[PDB]
Design a protein around this ligand. Structure first.
Ligand code: HEM
Ligand code: HEM
Ligand code: HEM
Ligand code: HEM
Ligand code: HEM
Ligand code: HEM
Lengths: 182, 182, 182, 182, 182, 182
């Protein structure tokens, strides 16, 4: 993934746990060489999976829980580190934002040539609920999606209950979530 | 037009008149189905013309006057809902901004693939006046242009006197305006 | 419009009437300064209108009649002068091509930054007809659209009868054409 | 997927089995409403899957076997229907072409705003082999990738033996193919 | 260069020296005709070199020193006149920002079609130093680069010692700088 | 530079001198590691310079003389290897083509994200001459520009005499060529 993703992980870990901790995860993940992540450069995805794996081992939390915290954090990180207006433009409520998410990432991708964005399709089941289809070239990120959705609930002051009902990891076509909001 | 246009109309009407009023216009325009406008999605232009037509009937104001208020509002709405830096970059005075307006919309259009922007050509007649040519794929929006120009005068603390001297609605090639400023 | 349009007019007139006629037309249009048109450079629309009025004068043909000739010509010109794959990609039947026309001009628009390309909306009224809405920032080019549709007919080996039912020139919102096709 | 993919299936099936068979397949897929596919318009992925399942049913062939046929076909189709220079530009040998494949789809992606194109990573294990990582937002298209590689073999006049070693469908992170080539 | 560059020069001179002074430089540079620079329009580069030359003569400072002040100012000007989020996104420290600078300008260039950005390559010689290669289509701007680097040191609260060790002006391939930081 | 440039050199040398000579050159350049060039991948400029110095050594020809040969070759190569329509689109005469050259590279630059393409400015000094300003982030490629102009002469069936009057290498701001053409 692009370096910004790995910077955001470093940032969350640094700020929640301090540098020493960050350095220990970084060392563990096999990454002590790298002096700093370059935000607009492409990195092999293993970099990210190794960080989360190392953070899990070093912090004594499951991987899923780090990916959940990271997803939530990302909503704050993008808004504060150069993408605040882009976020704002993608809408004003949870239901709208999720409909715009493919278009948001298409705009990201204008600037990040090599982006491999997720794809999100909403089927609204009521004015307060939907079924969300999450399609990705990557494996293993559903818990980051749950995190992101809660981050978005906070951003819109909207309570969000989310349950995953299909699992790309067991060989289903893709992840699917039922969501109720406000 | 893109959904953001219709959100901005909903916003202006909601904030100036309350929700109930907004809902009544929305119902009248034939649009009660739509739970929310999706900002980065393309809508049929009739959506917008129907809203203005319904707002006219429900508020008891002429259509032109709504389109005038809307034009002015739009200068505030874009600056506050995700396009504040883009607006800033298009310049620092009325004369400059209008020269940049085609380039501004070309930048908008990078992100809105399907954009059909207006085209604006300035002929400066003095360092305090110009003749503005407004060319559009759409009919009926000259009063939104007058609105926008006054919104831009406010933004630059510049007094703006604008008169329309050619009328695309009577079959002239396009709308033209004489403008004096400061 | 971009210089490719002006080159096409020069080429058409030259081919059909010889160079002496072309030079006369160019001179009458007030354009003898211009040594050659630069294909990817933007020109004032006025350049094209002057060429067409001057050609009308010099040839004894109405301008509208020349614009029909020019519209058919453009389909061949574009296919032979650098856009043949782009054209092929837009479809292999009349109705399909007309549906892809905005997307064709969007692809043109990636290469011509300053493009102001017409917008075309199809309402298919059966498998052998459609209503075509032509929306344009410019005036006076509906007869070219008639010639283009005929060029496309020949391209597909499809007979097509085009009849205009609404006229921008007279103050209607946009040109609308009723199209029967085999 | 974009309509060009669906056109290609229709063309392949038509060419190989005639129109009556094609119309039967299209009808069985629940698509008799659709008068023709619009090449540059986005369709629900479901349209393509339904066509392939309906073709499998109507022809007595497994869907996977049709997707291989379709993958080989696409290499010829794209080269003949508007993408021949683009294809040529991506290389003049199998390994080179496979290395340029993301960059080829990035160029496709400039023209198809909403493209969701596969990601392909090569690990060259010698001058006569590589391991190919196929990563996709979509399920079920690994057999098409097998057919495409064979089409590319013919394009280069290179024999190629493709054997899949990892399977998304069964829950593995992504499809991985082992490729020997002359 | 694009008009924004010349606006930024006018701004720095105006704010540091007042308008009268600005007007005198502007007059001297042969530019009194131009009522205002259009930020997103392309200008001949001589415009910029003439301004700096005139400012040098009128202010009684060497050209290099103006270009140094301008470079530093530019880091503030972009951050405040519409590019603050873009700047933020290009990173969080001197070493990272300089690695992202080509990507930053590639993003600028999406919006400025005709941009001729510099190219910057970093060779890191320690976690506190590098060798920076500055490649440009233009001559004469090395002192603006030194200015920019100090502006970036301020932005990141990082002390920066920079020495130029190759000179494109004497016919070396390009400018090179040794840099130590913090 | 992007791998297409290196492929072109390999192709030229191979075609003209056979493979054994090519392999010798590649080995002498220190590049025997590289199994093949990837057309759409960016390479360090050094790769190209090393190939040219190594070819000069192995063939007994000055590097400048090879770069002329390479410049003529590129006009044919690009027209035959995927860019023939793009080339055709840039004009049908020498002067027109030279005026469109920046716009041609802008279109190339949409496909090659990281392109650093030369800038070319024409001052037409009559209908049979121009002064050509070649501005480049890179050193040493003026003799290639001489070969390209000759390739373009042949393309148009236009004799052309190119004589360089200003030299970057010696410290002048940029290369300037005086061009007479039939
Ligand atoms: C303006 C804010 C955002 C920016 C700048 C941004 C940008 C990015 C970037 C650069 C990547 C890495 C993909 C790659 O390197 O190829 C990414 C991945 C991802 N994004 Fe966003 N994005 C933003 C908002 C969000 C939000 C709010 C969501 C929540 C729904 C989201 C969902 C995801 C997911 C789930 C991934 C993981 C990659 C995958 O699934 O394949 N994005 N995005
Ligand atoms: C950064 C601020 C702006 C943004 C994001 C923006 C974006 C838009 C969008 C999305 C549309 C709808 C067109 C379509 O959907 O195809 C539009 C239309 C329009 N814009 Fe802007 N624009 C902005 C600034 C302005 C300003 C300040 C003016 C005032 C001169 C202006 C003049 C217009 C007009 C008159 C239309 C009506 C459509 C037509 O004439 O065909 N724009 N713009
Ligand atoms: C690959 C083929 C084509 C290319 C490269 C091309 C490119 C262009 C260009 C450069 C313009 C000038 C617009 C401007 O300068 O702002 C133009 C205008 C135009 N195009 Fe196309 N185009 C193509 C095919 C067609 C076809 C087949 C049609 C038929 C419907 C068409 C309809 C028009 C019309 C009516 C205009 C006039 C401008 C206007 O109405 O405002 N185009 N196109
Ligand atoms: C110039 C040639 C090509 C063009 C114009 C083309 C264009 C496209 C398009 C439009 C899609 C549909 C994606 C979407 O709608 O979101 C697609 C998908 C696909 N392409 Fe290509 N492509 C080309 C060559 C190839 C080749 C040679 C391969 C062989 C490796 C390939 C691999 C695939 C695969 C496997 C997909 C399936 C979608 C997926 O896996 O998610 N493409 N491409
Ligand atoms: C978001 C902030 C920035 C923006 C909007 C911006 C944009 C620009 C623009 C429009 C030009 C004129 C080039 C042309 O007109 O063709 C330029 C030139 C230049 N930029 Fe930036 N840039 C920014 C940041 C910087 C920074 C921080 C540096 C410092 C390393 C930098 C280094 C340069 C240099 C040295 C030039 C001179 C032109 C040349 O060398 O050929 N840029 N940039
Ligand atoms: C369709 C035809 C062409 C294509 C696809 C093409 C593409 C390219 C590419 C990829 C580069 C490498 C730049 C980089 O990697 O950053 C390049 C450089 C170059 N191009 Fe072109 N180009 C074409 C035609 C021409 C022509 C006819 C000329 C003749 C004036 C020309 C002048 C040059 C020069 C002098 C460079 C050397 C790089 C430099 O000077 O910095 N190009 N072009």
């Amino acid at each position: 993934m692009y370096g910004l993703v790995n910077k955001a992980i470093q940032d969350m870990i640094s700020k929640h746990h301090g540098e020493d901790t960050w350095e220990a995860i970084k060392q563990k993940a096999g990454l002590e060489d790298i002096d700093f992540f370059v935000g607009m450069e492409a990195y092999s995805d293993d970099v990210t999976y190794h960080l989360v794996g190392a953070a899990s081992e070093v912090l004594g939390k499951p991987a899923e829980e780090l990916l959940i915290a990271f997803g939530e954090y990302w909503v704050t990180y993008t808004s504060e580190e150069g993408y605040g207006e882009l976020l704002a433009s993608a809408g004003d409520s949870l239901p709208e934002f999720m409909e715009n998410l493919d278009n948001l990432h298409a705009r990201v991708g204008l600037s990040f040539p090599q982006l491999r964005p997720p794809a999100f399709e909403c089927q609204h089941t009521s004015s307060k609920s939907m079924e969300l289809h999450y399609q990705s070239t990557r494996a293993g990120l559903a818990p980051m999606v749950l995190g992101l959705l809660h981050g978005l609930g906070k951003r819109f002051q909207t309570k969000v209950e989310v349950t995953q009902t299909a699992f790309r990891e067991t060989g289903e076509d893709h992840d699917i979530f039922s969501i109720k909001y406000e």
